[PDB]
Amino acid sequence: SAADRNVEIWKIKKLIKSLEAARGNGTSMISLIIPPKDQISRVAKMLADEFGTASNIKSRVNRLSVLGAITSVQQRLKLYNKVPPNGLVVYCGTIVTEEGKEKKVNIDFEPFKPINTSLYLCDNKFHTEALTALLSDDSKFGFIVIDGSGALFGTLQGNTREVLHKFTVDLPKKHGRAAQSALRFARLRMEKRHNYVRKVAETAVQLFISGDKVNVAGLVLAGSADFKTELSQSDMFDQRLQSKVLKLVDISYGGENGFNQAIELSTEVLSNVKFIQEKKLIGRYFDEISQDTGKYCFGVEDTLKALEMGAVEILIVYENLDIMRYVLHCQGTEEEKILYLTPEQEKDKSHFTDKETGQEHELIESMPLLEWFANNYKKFGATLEIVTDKSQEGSQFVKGFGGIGGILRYRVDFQG
């Protein structure tokens, strides 16, 4: 289900927030990630020698901490017997927190996406750079490696490299050694060679499409032998699929070994793509400003007022705002309100006296905005679009307009 997946992402994001905060005085913390294919024994051994080494650590508080963590991460791994699919992510240590409370913790879990990123570390802190880099890069891209020998269809995350389906074929010989039959055999060879392409072009629809919509934001075709092109520019390959043909890549090698080659030759394009789509969206946002229209908005005050009401269509936000939603509160009267304060206005501000009554209006702690949108953009109007300051249209959005706004579902006049 989609809702259960969104809960598991929120769970993991919250886990990361805590682990980045954690910290512990003295001590170290086992960052650890065991990729899908790995043998867990291999990990147990590694740990066991990492243990034996750590027993010569000169510092006590560090030593005994590290030994403890390694003792306990081994015990976690004992509860699994094969590596869970989609990898494993363990995070031992002895985190410190408020109240002077030294507490041990051992968070292991199969992460929801497969991942292809091993890591081991002892250091003062935990390392969750891998994990954030697997929530950021959703963008699944489809690969199809055509060759005279055979095909390979496969999907692709940031790091993760899946193999969907494949086959090979006995295509005919190049030549027909009779004078007349030469011509017929040629025409016949052309028919079976094309038929193979027809099969590939159907299979790709069968694999990379789902509910009359392609599941992959690109569709890299690869290979050699002027074949990938024969697919690329045919009437057989479905136009919604062929719309997202993103590259024809000439690879040496074929099949599985062909795959990796096809990805490394593709790397540059799949980066550009994410920026291209961003440029396109904001480009439209600006079109509504360029023409009078009315169906745009900008600056929290206006934008959220548009959201609250007959909502926006698309809401565009620069992926980090500073800007933060605070929940202000009164001591005596119990009257309360909420405000969207800038980095300067949030840090120190004499504004927040109650004035009418005459008391110090205390600001109960914040929830940072971009995250606030991410929580509850669905309870409004939808399509929360994170953007960047890399493109010229991107920067103009971030710099000028404030990296916040949205394309509206109809024309609205604003006042004050």
Partner: protein, 194 residues
């Protein structure tokens, strides 16, 4: 290499009547930056073309169209001979009078031709886009301008102008033509000119 000028027609802007509008509509100003400064008091709406995007929203909004934003080549920010105010017209370079020669100015009007001529007459000091004389001359070395302006400042060169609007000479000078030529004579060559 492209920058922006903002221009405010001091006649068409009436900040009291319209109650702002530019302030409210400008994203930079909503962003929280001093891109426009107006108030109901104070004539003429100011803009920091520095902080301006050049969104082209304020231009649409203002109810008399007082605000005109344009672009201009980044080259030309060096060679700025005169700018009368903030958000005013901006001449770049001057003509290069050479003596013994009639200098033909050409181009469409509303393009600083009068400002050029005032400057060259010496009535106008070319502020050089500051809004001085030794600092001015030094800016015009290597070029006939420095000889021109230096010549102006020690021997006061008399600046004489045949104006554009000919029909505001009548409403000023009285008497006959023959009388007026005699009064203004100095060369003593009326008959030859007539």
């Amino acid at each position: 290499k492209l920058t922006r000028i903002a221009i405010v027609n001091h006649d068409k802007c009436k900040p009291k009547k319209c109650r702002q509008e530019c302030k409210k509509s400008c994203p930079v100003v909503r962003m929280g930056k001093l891109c426009i400064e107006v108030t109901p008091q104070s004539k003429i709406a100011w803009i920091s073309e520095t902080l301006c995007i050049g969104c082209g929203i304020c231009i649409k909004k203002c109810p008399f169209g007082a605000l005109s934003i344009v672009n201009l080549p980044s080259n030309l920010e060096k060679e700025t001979t005169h700018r009368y105010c903030a958000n005013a017209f901006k001449l770049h370079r001057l003509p290069i009078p050479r003596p013994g020669e009639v200098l033909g100015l050409v181009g469409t009007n509303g393009i600083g031709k009068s400002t050029a001529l005032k400057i060259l007459a010496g009535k106008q000091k070319p502020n050089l886009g500051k809004y001085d004389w030794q600092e001015i001359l030094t800016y015009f070395r290597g070029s006939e301008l420095q000889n021109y302006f230096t010549k102006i400042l020690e021997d006061d060169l008399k600046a004489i102008i045949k104006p554009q609007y000919v029909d505001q000479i009548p409403k000023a000078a009285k008497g006959t033509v023959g009388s007026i030529l005699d009064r203004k004579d100095e060369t003593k060559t009326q008959a030859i000119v007539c």
